[PDB]
Design a protein around this ligand. Sequence first.
Ligand SMILES: Cc1cc2nc3c(=O)[nH]c(=O)nc-3n(C[C@H](O)[C@H](O)[C@H](O)COP(=O)(O)OP(=O)(O)OC[C@H]3O[C@@H](n4cnc5c(N)ncnc54)[C@H](O)[C@@H]3O)c2cc1C
Ligand SMILES: Cc1cc2nc3c(=O)[nH]c(=O)nc-3n(C[C@H](O)[C@H](O)[C@H](O)COP(=O)(O)OP(=O)(O)OC[C@H]3O[C@@H](n4cnc5c(N)ncnc54)[C@H](O)[C@@H]3O)c2cc1C
Ligand SMILES: Cn1c(CCCO)c(CO)c2c1C(=O)C=C(N1CC1)C2=O
Ligand SMILES: Cn1c(CCCO)c(CO)c2c1C(=O)C=C(N1CC1)C2=O
Lengths: 273, 273
Amino acid sequence: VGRRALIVLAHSERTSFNYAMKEAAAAALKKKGWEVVESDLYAMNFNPIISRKDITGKLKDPANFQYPAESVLAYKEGHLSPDIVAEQKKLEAADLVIFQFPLQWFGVPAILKGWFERVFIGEFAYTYAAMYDKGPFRSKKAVLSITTGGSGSMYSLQGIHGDMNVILWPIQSGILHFCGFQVLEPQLTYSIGHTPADARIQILEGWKKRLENIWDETPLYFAPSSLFDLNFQAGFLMKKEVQDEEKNKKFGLSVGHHLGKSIPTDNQIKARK
Amino acid sequence: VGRRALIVLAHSERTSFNYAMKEAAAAALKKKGWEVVESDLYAMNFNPIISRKDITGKLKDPANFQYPAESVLAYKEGHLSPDIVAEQKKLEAADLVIFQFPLQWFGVPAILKGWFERVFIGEFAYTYAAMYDKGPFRSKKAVLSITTGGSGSMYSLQGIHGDMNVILWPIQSGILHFCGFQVLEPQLTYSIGHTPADARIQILEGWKKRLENIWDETPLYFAPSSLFDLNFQAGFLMKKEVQDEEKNKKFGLSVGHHLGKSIPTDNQIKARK
Ligand SMILES: Cc1cc2nc3c(=O)[nH]c(=O)nc-3n(C[C@H](O)[C@H](O)[C@H](O)COP(=O)(O)OP(=O)(O)OC[C@H]3O[C@@H](n4cnc5c(N)ncnc54)[C@H](O)[C@@H]3O)c2cc1C
Ligand SMILES: Cc1cc2nc3c(=O)[nH]c(=O)nc-3n(C[C@H](O)[C@H](O)[C@H](O)COP(=O)(O)OP(=O)(O)OC[C@H]3O[C@@H](n4cnc5c(N)ncnc54)[C@H](O)[C@@H]3O)c2cc1C
Ligand SMILES: Cn1c(CCCO)c(CO)c2c1C(=O)C=C(N1CC1)C2=O
Ligand SMILES: Cn1c(CCCO)c(CO)c2c1C(=O)C=C(N1CC1)C2=O
C-alpha cells in the first residue's frame, strides 16, 4: 500500500484553484492517514533549466558537455546539485505522486517541465534495460490533476483542439510510465474559469472523495514491454509474433501504439483495457 | 515570399549538433538572401518562468492575479516586460520561424516551453475569434528541427515510444497552428548521438539544401476551422453536415481529429493530405 504521498504543484498564486486543489488533496490524504510532502515549485524558487550547474563535481568531459552522461555520473558519484538531490529524496520516499497544474500550451508549465528534466536523471528515474513497466518507479503510482481554460467539448473527438487523449500521451507515457510509474486516471477539470462557485466547491470535494480510495484504482493501460524486442539490434520493435497477432485486432493498443488502426476510447483518460 | 527568418535555438552547448544545425540554417538562408535573426535562449539567459513580473504596469486585479487576462491587458496597453516585447518584435518581423532543439521528455526543452508561455500572449499570438488557420501568424510558416537520442525505429508505429506523430501534434497543432502558423514538415534527425561523422556532415548539408526552397513547400495538413462551429454555445464542435460526410470516410482528418478512425500516415511528418 501507500502511507506516503508527494504532491508537486506548478502555480504561482495561493489564490488559484490549483492551489485549492493542492490543499484539498493534502487534507484528504492526511485524514486518511497518509504522510504528505509537497513540492510547490514556485514557492521553492525552483530552477527549471538543466545546465552544467546541476553537477557540483568535476565533469568527465568539460570541453564537450553532455547532460545525459554527465548527470548520470554526477548521480552515481554523489555530486548533483543539492536541490535536485532533495527532490530525488522525496520521489524515493513517495508511494503516490500527484502532479497538480493548469494546462499551458497543450502541456505542463515550463517550470514543471524543467522539474522533470533536472530531476528524472538516468539511473535514478530510468535505464534503457528497465524501461516502462520495468522502470525504477514501478512500485509507485502517479496521477495528473489538470485544470484548463477551454471547455471539455473543445477536447472531444470533434472538438477543435482535438482529442485530449493525444495531448496526455506524451506526458503520461513518455515521462511517467517510462520510468515505471503506474499512471492512474487523470483528474481533469475543464474551463475552471467558467465554473459557478457551487460547482467549484463540488469539484474540490469530488477530488477529495476520490483520494480516499486512490491507491486501489486500476491504472491506465499501456502496452507491456514484453511485446517488444528490447534491444538496439532489434530497434526496440514489437515482436513479430505480436505484430501478427494484432493484425486481427480492430483497435490499436494505445494512443502511441494506435498501429494505424483505431485508438481505443479514452485510453489515456479511462482505465480498464 | 519571405525575406526574414527567425531561428530559436534551445541548447546550452555551442559544441552540440543543435548549434551546428542552427549555424547551417543561418548560413544557408543568408546565401539565398534572407534577413536572419536569432534567439539563442540559453545564450540570452532567457527567463522562461511566467509571473506577475511579466507585467510592468498596474494590474487590474493584483489580489487575484490571473495571467491570461492581465497579460493581454499589458500587451494592449503596452506594459509587457521589455524582454518579452523584444521577442514579440522578432516574430512580427519574421516570415519564417525555425525551432532548433533536442527532444527532451517527448517534448520541447523547458526553456523553449517557457518562451512560448511568455511570448505567445493573447491578442498578439492568438484570439479565440481567430483560432488556428485564421490566427495572427497565418502568413508565417514554422518549422521544427528536432534531434533525438532514440532511433527512428523506436518512434515508428511498432516502436516502444510509439508514433512520433502523436508526440508532434500537441506542439505543431496546439501551439504553432493554433496561432495561425503554417507548419512545415519537421526536420527530424534521430539518434544523432550514434551517427557517424560523415553521416552528421551530410545531415547538415541536407538541411541547408532543404532551406533553399523551404518557402515553396506545401505545409502539413490540419482540419480547417471552417469545419467547426466556432462558438461557445456550440462547444466548438465539428458542424453536423461535416460530421455526416465524414461518417463514410475511412481515415480521420489528422492526429488530433482521428475521429476514432485511422489516423492518416505521417499526418504530422509528411505533407500533402
Ligand atoms: C501561459 C498559459 C497557457 C495556457 N494554455 C492553455 C491551453 O493550451 N489549453 C487550455 O485549455 N487552457 C490554457 N490555459 C488556461 C489555464 O489552464 C487556466 O487559466 C487555469 O487552468 C485556470 O486555473 P487556476 O487555478 O490557475 O486559476 P484561476 O483562473 O484563478 O481560477 C480558479 C477559480 O476558482 C476560484 N477559487 C480559487 N480558490 C477557490 C476555492 N478554494 N474554492 C472555490 N473556488 C476557488 C477563483 O476565484 C477562480 O475564479 C493557459 C494559461 C496560461 C497562463
Ligand atoms: C533532459 C533530457 C531529456 C531527453 N529526453 C529525450 C527523449 O524524450 N527522447 C529522445 O529520443 N531523446 C531524449 N534526449 C536525448 C537528446 O535528444 C539527445 O541527447 C540530443 O538530441 C543529442 O544532440 P545534441 O546536438 O544536443 O548534442 P551532442 O550529443 O553533442 O551530439 C552532437 C554530435 O554531433 C557532433 N557534432 C557537433 N557539431 C558538429 C558539426 N558541425 N558537424 C558534425 N558533427 C558535429 C558532436 O561531436 C556529437 O557527437 C534527452 C536529453 C536530455 C538531456
Ligand atoms: C489563456 N488561455 C485560455 C483561458 C482563458 C480564460 O480567461 C484558454 C481556453 O480557451 C486557452 C489559452 C491559451 O493560451 C491557449 C489555448 N490554445 C492552446 C489551446 C486555449 O485554449
Ligand atoms: C538522454 N536520453 C537518450 C540519449 C542517449 C544517448 O546515448 C535517449 C534515447 O534513448 C533517451 C534519453 C532520456 O533522458 C529519456 C528517454 N525517454 C523519454 C523517452 C530516452 O529515450
